[PDB]
Design a protein around this nucleic acid. Structure first.
Ligand SMILES: [Zn+2]
Ligand SMILES: [Zn+2]
Ligand SMILES: [Zn+2]
Length: 89
DNA sequence: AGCGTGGGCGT
DNA sequence: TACGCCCACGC
């Protein structure tokens, strides 16, 4: 296929074009969590999710609302997406 | 609301 | 292989 990296775990049929994508996926089956927060010691399956988790400790909110007169800002881009959607609907 | 944790995707 | 990015769903 164009998706040679197939998951063979029991009752899973997912396949991927990339072996690293498959490796990340399989952590949902094994429970493996390689990335640990240095502040609170919680462990995470993914590096990017550790990174956004750490902002919960610092209050860093790099994503600011663009709506005039709005002061809201957010830790993650998707929070801001939801928020912008809210303003116009 | 805030944030866990998958996906496709880029580099 | 490393690390994320945005998108999205689900509490
Ligand atoms: Zn699988
Ligand atoms: Zn933490
Ligand atoms: Zn706003």
């Amino acid at each position: 296929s164009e998706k040679p990296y197939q998951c063979d775990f029991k009752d899973c049929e997912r396949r991927f074009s990339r072996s690293d994508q498959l490796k990340r996926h399989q952590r949902r089956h094994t429970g493996v969590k390689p990335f640990q927060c240095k502040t609170c010691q919680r462990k995470f399956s993914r590096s990017d999710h550790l990174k956004t988790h750490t902002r919960t400790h610092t209050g860093e909110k790099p994503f600011s609302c663009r709506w005039p007169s709005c002061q809201k800002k957010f830790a993650r881009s998707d929070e801001l997406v939801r928020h912008h959607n809210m303003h116009q609907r």
